[PDB]
Ligand SMILES: *[C@@H]1O[C@H](CO)[C@@H](O)[C@H](O)[C@H]1NC(C)=O
Ligand SMILES: *[C@@H]1O[C@H](CO)[C@@H](O)[C@H](O)[C@H]1NC(C)=O
Ligand SMILES: *[C@@H]1O[C@H](CO)[C@@H](O)[C@H](O)[C@H]1NC(C)=O
Ligand SMILES: *[C@@H]1O[C@H](CO)[C@@H](O)[C@H](O)[C@H]1NC(C)=O
Ligand SMILES: *[C@@H]1O[C@H](CO)[C@@H](O)[C@H](O)[C@H]1NC(C)=O
């Protein structure tokens with residue numbers, strides 16, 4: 512990465528900004544920009560790149576082989592009882608949430624057993640979180 | 647990475663900013679920018695890159711093999727009872743949350759058993775957290 | 782990394798900033814910038830890079846092999862009883878939370894058993910935390 516920027520409201524290379532109830536009288540502006548950008552990014556010069564994988568088995572007896580990849584998500588229980596008994600009452604529930612395992616951004620790569628990789632891996636995330644807003 | 651920037655509200659290379667109720671009278675501005683940027687980033691020169699993996703088995707007896715990858719997420723219980731008994735009452739629940747295992751940003755890479763990698767891995771995250779806002 | 786910056790509100794290379802209720806009278810501005818940036822970042826010159834892995838087994842008897850990767854997340858119980866008995870009362874619950882294992886940013890890399898890596902690993906995180914805001 513080169514340039515990652517947080518800007519909440521206003522991004523401006525040049526901003527002549529005037530707010531409300533202003534007397535903008537007798538202003539003379541002269542502006543010159545000579546902006547030059549040169550990028551030479553992510554260059555590879557490989558004469559020879561070799562990835563080699565060999566598995567050899569010879570007169571071998573194999574038994575009881577178990578191979579499990581990542582994320583073995585197994586034997587899990589969720590129990591959220593909600594038992595409400597009522598009699599002659601005044602209920603006022605305005606902003607109440609019951610959230611179970613909510614996914615917002617999930618990013619997973621190359622989640623494997625055997626991997627041979629030559630190169631680049633890049634992730635960028637930019638949001639603004641706001642879960643609950645109740646007036 | 648080169649340039650990572652936090653800006654909450656306003657980002658400006660040049661900002662002539664005037665707020666409210668202002669008398670902006672008799673101003674003369676002369677502005678010159680000569681901005682030059684040169685980037686030579688992430689360059690690799692490899693004459694020979696070799697990755698080698700060999701597994702050899704010879705007249706071998708194998709039994710009871712168990713290989714488990716990462717994140718063996720196993721035998722877990724969640725129990726959240728909510729038993730409310732009522733009689734002749736006034737309930738006022740405004741902003742109440744019941745949150746269980748909420749995912750917001752999950753980033754995981756290359757979560758494997760056997761990995762051979764040559765290169766770059768980059769992650770950038772920029773947000774603004776705000777879970778609960780109740781008036 | 783080179784330049785990581787915290788800016789809460791306002792970031793400006795040049796800021797002529799005037800607030801409210803101001804008499805900006807008779808101002809003469811002359812401004813010159815000659816800004817030059819040169820970057821030569823993350824350069825590698827390898828004539829020969831070799832990664833070598835060999836496993837050899839010869840007439841060997843193997844039994845009771847258990848290999849477990851990282852994050853063996855096993856046999857865990859959560860119990861949060863909420864038993865409320867009521868009779869003829871006035872309840873005022875404004876801003877109450879019940880949060881269990883909430884994920885906000887989780888970043889994990891290369892969480893493996895066997896890894897052979899040549900290169901770069903970079904992470905940048907910039908947020909603004911605010912869990913509970915209740916008026
Ligand atoms: C604005 O400039 C003109 C010419 O320079 C001048 O005649 C005028 O009086 C100026 N305005 C004020 C309010 O002085
Ligand atoms: C930019 O413009 C101004 C306006 O008069 C001038 O004086 C200056 O020489 C210019 N610069 C370039 C690099 O063009
Ligand atoms: C890649 O190409 C040739 C091969 O070695 C090399 O001479 C050249 O300088 C390299 N180019 C860049 C932009 O790095
Ligand atoms: C392992 O082998 C025994 C007998 O050889 C068998 O009963 C058992 O089920 C095997 N394990 C698995 C996980 O299959
Ligand atoms: C603004 O400038 C002009 C010309 O220089 C001048 O005549 C005028 O009086 C100035 N304004 C004030 C308020 O002095």
Ligand SMILES: *[C@@H]1O[C@H](CO)[C@@H](O)[C@H](O)[C@H]1NC(C)=O
Nearest residue numbers: 543676677678679680813815
């Ligand atoms: C920028 O502009 C000003 C305006 O007069 C000038 O005096 C100066 O020589 C300029 N500089 C360049 C580098 O162009």
Ligand SMILES: *[C@@H]1O[C@H](CO)[C@@H](O)[C@H](O)[C@H]1NC(C)=O
Nearest residue numbers: 554556686689690691824826
């Ligand atoms: C990569 O390419 C050639 C190969 O060695 C080298 O002479 C050159 O200087 C390198 N280029 C850069 C931009 O590093």
Ligand SMILES: *[C@@H]1O[C@H](CO)[C@@H](O)[C@H](O)[C@H]1NC(C)=O
Nearest residue numbers: 575577709710711712844845
């Ligand atoms: C290990 O081997 C025994 C007998 O050889 C078998 O009963 C058992 O199930 C094996 N273990 C697993 C995890 O399968």
Ligand SMILES: *[C@@H]1O[C@H](CO)[C@@H](O)[C@H](O)[C@H]1NC(C)=O
Nearest residue numbers: 671672673805806807808809
């Ligand atoms: C602003 O400048 C002009 C010209 O230099 C001058 O005539 C005027 O009186 C100035 N303003 C004030 C308030 O003195």
Ligand SMILES: *[C@@H]1O[C@H](CO)[C@@H](O)[C@H](O)[C@H]1NC(C)=O
Nearest residue numbers: 676678680811812813814815
């Ligand atoms: C920048 O601009 C000013 C404006 O007059 C000038 O005097 C100066 O020589 C300039 N410098 C360069 C490096 O252009």
Ligand SMILES: *[C@@H]1O[C@H](CO)[C@@H](O)[C@H](O)[C@H]1NC(C)=O
Nearest residue numbers: 686689691821824825826827
């Ligand atoms: C990398 O390329 C060649 C190979 O040795 C070397 O002469 C050159 O100076 C290097 N380039 C950089 C930018 O370091």
Ligand SMILES: *[C@@H]1O[C@H](CO)[C@@H](O)[C@H](O)[C@H]1NC(C)=O
Nearest residue numbers: 709710711712844845846847
């Ligand atoms: C280890 O071996 C014994 C008998 O050889 C078997 O009963 C047991 O289950 C094995 N352990 C595991 C974890 O499988």
